Every structure is written in structure tokens, then in C-alpha cells.
């Protein structure tokens, strides 16, 4: 599913991302924009055989299991396919685990380079939240 900006903002708010770990809602919307362009089915293959999945491009060697890299971690305890669902629950729950381990949103380089320090509130402007 390709979410609309405000549609995604509303879904993320319903799932408790607004101000989660000190990050206002716009941070999450901006991160999703630059990671997946709001497409839940976004995937990207890496040189080590791992794959990044979903709206927040979560990596399979650490956060989820896709069985393609035996011995890898599955810190979010979920099949990577769950991160491609039109229902963003799995992506949100995993993002919460990632952002709360001590590195904040810097875990998403795209967020650090394209969102950090900007007027992130602009991403939820004009939205019915």
C-alpha cells in the first residue's frame, strides 16, 4: 500500500508514534518519506544478502527474519513479510524497539541526513490528526 502523507501521519499517531522516545510525529513521517516514499511494499537488497523492508526500511540481518541469512538476528521477533503489510502495526512496533535502544532515530541515516534539524512539524501540517 502506498500511503498518502496525512493518511500515514494519522495511522502513525493511532499507533502511538507521536512524541515516542522524544520524536514528534513529523520525524516519523519524514523518515518514511525518504526511506520508502510511503510504500509499505518497498524492499531493497544489500550486498550481504540482507534486505530492508517496509515504510521504514528495516534490515533483515538484525530486526526481522526472512530466512535468507541463516544465523542472523530477529530482534523484533517477526517475519520480515509483516513489514510489507498495508497494516503498519508491525513496522511501528519494530521502529519503537529500534529507536528505544539508545541511538534514537540516528539508526535511520536517511532521517539524520534529510529530517533531523528541519521543520519536521511541516510533515503533519494540514492533516486531520
Amino acid at each position, epitope marked *: 500500500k502506498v500511503f498518502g502523507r496525512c493518511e500515514l501521519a494519522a495511522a502513525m499517531k493511532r499507533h502511538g508514534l507521536d512524541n515516542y522516545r522524544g520524536y514528534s510525529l513529523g520525524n516519523w513521517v519524514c523518515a518514511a518519506k525518504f*526511506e520508502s516514499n510511503f510504500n509499505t511494499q518497498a524492499t*531493497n537488497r*544489500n*550486498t*550481504d*544478502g*540482507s534486505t*530492508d523492508y517496509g515504510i*521504514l*526500511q*528495516i*534490515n533483515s*540481518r*538484525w*530486526w526481522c527474519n526472512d530466512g535468507r*541469512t541463516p544465523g*542472523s*538476528r530477529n*530482534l523484533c521477533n517477526i517475519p520480515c513479510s509483516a513489514l510489507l503489510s498495508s497494516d503498519i502495526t508491525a513496522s511501528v512496533n519494530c*521502529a519503537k524497539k*529500534i529507536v528505544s*535502544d539508545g*541511538n534514537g532515530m*540516528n*539508526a*535511520w*541515516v*536517511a532521517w539524520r541526513n534529510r529530517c533531523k534539524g528541519t521543520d519536521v512539524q511541516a510533515w503533519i501540517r494540514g492533516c486531520r490528526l
Partner: nanobody
Amino acid sequence: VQLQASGGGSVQAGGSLRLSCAASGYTIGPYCMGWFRQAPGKEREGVAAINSGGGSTYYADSVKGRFTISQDNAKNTVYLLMNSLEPEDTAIYYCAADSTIYASYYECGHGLSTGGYGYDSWGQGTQVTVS
């Protein structure tokens, strides 16, 4: 974390040396383990890096073909085999690590040419001298 390394020393040009490094204080990471070096009076520079997850390796052009970085991710250790050493390789070598568990795939080689950006942990430095 706390990085401790061993090995190195003095050797004649054309010789070989093998550096070892162990990280202590991690529970999940590190995400990256690498080697940097600093010649007398110069700024520190990257040498090689490796992704703890996956084992992808990265090297500075100055050492490609002569140096090989390897690891034991289960024990949070990293190694640097240095063959065909030359006088210009003389410097203080540093073991380094990036503790951030990135969400999306992150190439550990990025910090090699960006002044060690991302590498938050550093060893004390081990001398390597090539005559």
C-alpha cells in the same frame, strides 16, 4: 565499549604483521569494527572496516590488495592482516567500532573516508613501524 588491541610492532619493508582487537561492554553490537591509522603529525585516516553482520569488507585505496580485515562476530573481535608492508605504512593503528544498530543496511566503509564518522569507540593505539 572498550577496545583493546595487540600485535603490530616493527618489521622490514615487505614483511607482514597481524593486528587483533577485542571489544568489551557490548551486549548486541557492535555494528561495525574497523581499523584507522595516524602517521606522525598527520590526521587520522581510515584503513579498513567490516560489518559485524554479513561480513562485508571495505578498504582504503592505499591498502587494497595488501591488507585483509576479518572478524569473529560471535566474540566481538576483529583482525587486520598486513602483508607487503612499506615505510609509508608506519603509523599508530587504531581499532574502532560503531555501536549503532542501524535500522536500514549501513555500509561500515562510510566512516573510513569521513573522519571516522559513526565510530564512537576507539582503542588506545598500537604502533606499527616499517623500516
